[PDB]
Write a protein that binds this ligand. Structure first.
Ligand SMILES: Nc1ncnc2c1ncn2[C@@H]1O[C@H](COP(=O)(O)OP(=O)(O)O)[C@@H](O)[C@H]1O
Ligand SMILES: Nc1ncnc2c1ncn2[C@@H]1O[C@H](COP(=O)(O)OP(=O)(O)O)[C@@H](O)[C@H]1O
Ligand SMILES: [Mg+2]
Lengths: 300, 300
């Protein structure tokens, strides 16, 4: 059983011919609404992947409030903890060029009012894995770590994007899960070209975070694991059609893979299969695989 | 009296730290609904300067629609010719951070449904200037220029934002108004860095629009004019916070100067005063100046 302590955003997606330069105005097409948020994506991905999960966060009392809420439950995810707030929900401002080069910005609204005291013990009860991204406040992440620990959950932090973390928040975490961009401003060195220039950046985190097994997500090249050992996990070779649900469909899948009680090697190859088959379909949440394909891909 | 035939959009302004790149969701503060669109901005720009002005354009049924119409009515814009339309209003996606930086992407909404059939002759009766931009269909620009000239109105085309123009429009226009980028796109020339290069470019644009006065704006270097004179009009020195709507303030002031029977030397200086003042306050329409300020700038 998993607890996502993470963000709920309805996204406004607006196609342009080329992305605007600074100071430049461009006309695009009519925007569309799809549920966004690393947190929500992660819960759906987990349910899709055949697993019991619950969202802890906060939706608005605008129209999109109930859509975030609804769609999440239709996937088969317990939303009992999805606490309603005034103002809008969360909203993301997505500009996609016809190639997939896109530009995302997120209005937190209801996500940035999910407070350190909103977190109630019973959200965390019976939970095997607490999954944290940073599309919710920070003290709500220091606090969500501590309560997941008190409930006997493994703390998986998906840091998306990167900040400066004191070793306060890495002797607290059971697994750190990052992509190239994040690994780069969590160390202040050259972003990883090879799996070697990564497996290094791994020990340069595992350095800060002794008993936190570190996972680093490469794209096209997969991911490396520097913990009980040092390893590289080949990506699955498939047509990079769309990379919405990046270190994200991986994150949900890893969280679910460890919850369901798979060894680390298998949950990583599960997360690779997951966030590869994410790329072969267009869009955020419709791309996020069912257990059917992943379990079928992972034998053929 | 001025008819503006053009766009009405609700600006959504997200206040973020940095502007993104691929596969990297970025976290703002909270979007802030502001009334916008080049057509409504220019119409408001004309009314704040004490101009008689009509807006001909399409807002959607949605709540932004009723808010855009009232907004204009509240500023003294004749909104008799503002049409309700199924679907959503146009929407400004306006990312804005500390230094000011603005990445305007425009969802067209009901603006894209403003068709030639929607321009009735009485909106043109007794109009001295028809003021157009390029956030409505090109077929509507053609028809608006024909109806303006039938009624004896001067046709001012603000060819913004940047767009190829067929010779049927270019041959139809009394005044062609463009910034550096629109000039360069219509001429396949390098954007000019000096009034001397901008006049040469203005002169070349005039070969596609030989019946037109051509005006080319240079932000902090003012504007050039190619037609009955070849001249530079200096920028007013000011503290610029947000260059958004500065073009609108420029286009509206020029329009109004000419409606009032000012020569181009007077109306361009007038336009440079209004443009300068729009840079000094934050946001789009809100930053458009009142005539007393422009008059205070014009003669210190
Ligand atoms: N931007 C990213 N940076 C790093 N790893 C990523 C990124 N996006 C996705 N991943 C994950 O890393 C692995 C390899 O990238 P992926 O996009 O699958 O490449 P491929 O198209 O070769 O399958 C996958 O498991 C994927 O989910
Ligand atoms: N920094 C500035 N100082 C003074 N006037 C300015 C400044 N920036 C813009 N303006 C005024 O606004 C007008 C239009 O500016 P410009 O940036 O060319 O418009 P656009 O927004 O259409 O690109 C200028 O011609 C001038 O009148
Ligand atoms: Mg301004």
């Amino acid at each position: 059983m998993i607890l996502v302590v993470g963000s709920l955003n309805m996204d406004l997606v607006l196609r342009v011919k080329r992305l605007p330069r600074p100071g430049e105005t461009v006309l695009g097409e009519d925007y569309q609404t799809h549920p966004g948020g690393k947190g929500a994506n992660q819960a759906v991905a987990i349910a899709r992947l055949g697993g019991k999960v619950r969202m802890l966060g906060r939706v608005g009392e605008d129209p999109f409030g109930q859509a975030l809420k609804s769609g999440l439950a239709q996937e088969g995810v317990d939303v009992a903890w999805v606490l309603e707030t005034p103002g809008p929900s969360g909203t993301g401002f997505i500009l996609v060029d016809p190639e997939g080069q896109n530009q995302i910005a997120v209005a937190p609204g209801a996500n940035a009012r999910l407070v350190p005291e909103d977190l109630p013990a019973t959200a965390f009860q019976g939970v095997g894995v607490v999954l944290l991204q940073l599309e919710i406040p920070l003290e709500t992440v220091v606090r969500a770590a501590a309560l997941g620990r008190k409930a006997g959950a493994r703390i998986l932090l998906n840091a998306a994007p990167a900040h400066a973390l004191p070793s306060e928040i890495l002797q607290s975490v059971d697994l750190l899960l990052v992509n190239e961009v994040e690994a780069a401003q969590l160390t202040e060195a050259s972003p990883p070209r090879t799996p070697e220039e990564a497996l290094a950046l791994a020990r340069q985190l595992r350095g800060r975070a002794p008993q936190a097994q570190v996972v680093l997500t490469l794209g096209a090249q997969g991911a490396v694991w520097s913990g009980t050992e040092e390893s590289h996990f080949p990506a699955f070779p498939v047509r990079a059609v769309d990379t919405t649900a990046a270190g994200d469909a991986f994150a949900g899948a890893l969280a679910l893979g460890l919850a369901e009680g798979q060894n680390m090697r298998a949950a990583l190859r599960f997360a690779n299969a997951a966030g590869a088959l994410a790329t072969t379909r267009p869009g955020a949440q419709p791309s996020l695989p069912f257990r059917d394909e992943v379990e079928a891909l992972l034998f053929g």
